Amino acid sequence: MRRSQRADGLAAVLAIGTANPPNCVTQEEIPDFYFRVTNSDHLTALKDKFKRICQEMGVQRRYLHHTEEMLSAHPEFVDRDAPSLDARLDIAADAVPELAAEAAKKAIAEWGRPAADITHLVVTTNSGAHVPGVDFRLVPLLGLRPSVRRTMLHLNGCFAGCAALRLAKDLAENSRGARVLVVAAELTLMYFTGPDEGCFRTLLVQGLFGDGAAAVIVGADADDVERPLFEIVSAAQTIIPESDHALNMRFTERRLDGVLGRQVPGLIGDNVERCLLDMFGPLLGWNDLFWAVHPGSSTIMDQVDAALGLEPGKLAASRRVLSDYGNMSGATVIFALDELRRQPELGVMMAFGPGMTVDAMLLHATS
């Protein structure tokens, strides 16, 4: 027999919606919040270091699902040695679908079609470890059809957003009329703990990471009501050799833990241009493109600017998101795309994560 009916055009971003927990904390307030809630206000020298750390990261505010009352109800969280994964996951099991549903509802309202018209759902988050997972939970929350084709991607780290969208391109293009809802979400309560007594990596997490969810509707062959924002021309992925030790994460009994190596910015700076040329090559002056890049930190952005000889305005959307929300793992790069669209015909949407891996898409912007 023959193939099913497929799409004609490229998969396109048709809508983007985003969401954050209500608890907003500025960089200036973060030291006071973190040191109070972890019973560490007597550690003056350490607090002062954290203050200086926080000022150099390019983050101005973030949104946190956890609050003083939540942490008071869960003192095990601040104890670096206490098992507490169960309690973190229990909160995440409820909170992530709620936050994801809020972002998805806004994407669907922008899209202009009913939730019942979604045929595929791709969900990615580090902040979950359940079957049925967030993908299942969204079904009744959004009123999806029971036969929606779901993909649950637990724990894919910083490249997770781009990884999920790469999948959505193929799902959207391989069935006529397919409409894919992509959701990435991140809750930093999974990492939250008391101060370290080494090189300050929990403090790095505290200064850099925030919570959010981003939802994207992806579809080929837009109809009359739909409004394509970007076509996904190509989606690729590659590996920086000999760099798995520099960045990694895993579930533990105590929390989501890992390594945020000082090598990371340099590795990105040294390799980004070659990665893009290996990934896209034939399909493409880096200043002739637009950019939606997973920010990481101010330093990582500086590394990317330098490596690619980028003008100041090129990473502005990506920097803005970092400034306004902090790093939200997989969702961050989609916030960046959303910011870019609010602010060249061809462009690059990319994210680096553990591996080290780069996930990137070549995007074409509706004129």
Place this chain on the structure above:
Amino acid sequence: SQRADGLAAVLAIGTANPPNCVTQEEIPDFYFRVTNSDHLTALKDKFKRICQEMGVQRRYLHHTEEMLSAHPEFVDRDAPSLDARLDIAADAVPELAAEAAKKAIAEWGRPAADITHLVVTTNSGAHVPGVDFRLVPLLGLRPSVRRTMLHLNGCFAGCAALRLAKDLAENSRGARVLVVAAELTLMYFTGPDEGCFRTLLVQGLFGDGAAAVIVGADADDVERPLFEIVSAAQTIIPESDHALNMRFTERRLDGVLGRQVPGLIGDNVERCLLDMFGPLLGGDGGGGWNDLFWAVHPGSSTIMDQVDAALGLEPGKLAASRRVLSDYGNMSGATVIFALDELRRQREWPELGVMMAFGPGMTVDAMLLHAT
């Protein structure tokens, strides 16, 4: 921007299991000794019954007495031990997966360098970089292989990964997708509970394994397609999330194995298949559901009996699925791929068939297959 022309096809299947084989006859003694539980005479009786009567004859386990001695906290139901289990799995899963993958590649007949996409699924890991990244140097994949790592998708995981593979293979010309599902039961291993028997079920029914599949459209002269994937679909049984679930905990991978599971499958399977495939199941035939071949995730003999009774299947239809249960036990997402492989060595045979798996949700993932 060059797409494939025709249907995605299964081009090779390769499987692997840990070397330690354990028969159902020796399991009761072994388990009750190693968990210091020999005084629980009646509990062990329940366990014997579970081991003898639910359709499993042998299993392959990565964990051994030696490994259990080195990790006594595994045996303690209250001790945090997720780190130690995950540390073992970080190394063992990619090795087992690599063995299955290499057999699939050898059957396939092209070099590993020709693989363009990799889709990996396991309950037995929680790492970034994950098993997918680890397989790159193990198999000699190109660094630019497009990887998808699906942690913790339960029993439907193998079917869900193949659903992805179909679209990946069909939307890019020349694309060749390696799909691997692997499962290690040391993730769940623990001592028994006298009041409740969910642990006894896991210890009686679940085994370890890895299965690998090469998926591609537009077969070469050198490739030998085994099955074309006509359609891949998924659906939900309403009001059944309480019956069956799983999660990471501090102590182990844990969950619920409800009494109602076989009955829910029996009550809903026919409706699910008809919802999922619709007009594609039109035509006849002469034997209704017996017109088709079947590769289904087994679960238990009762679950297979429920599928039989629901679809009016003759004894031979689920024989390949029951044989897998018998020879390997349940290996989560990998099991239905073992079933497809058994079916393939078993073979006028039906042209059209269903490959399906039920998991938490409850969800069914299913593919309509055309054998060529």
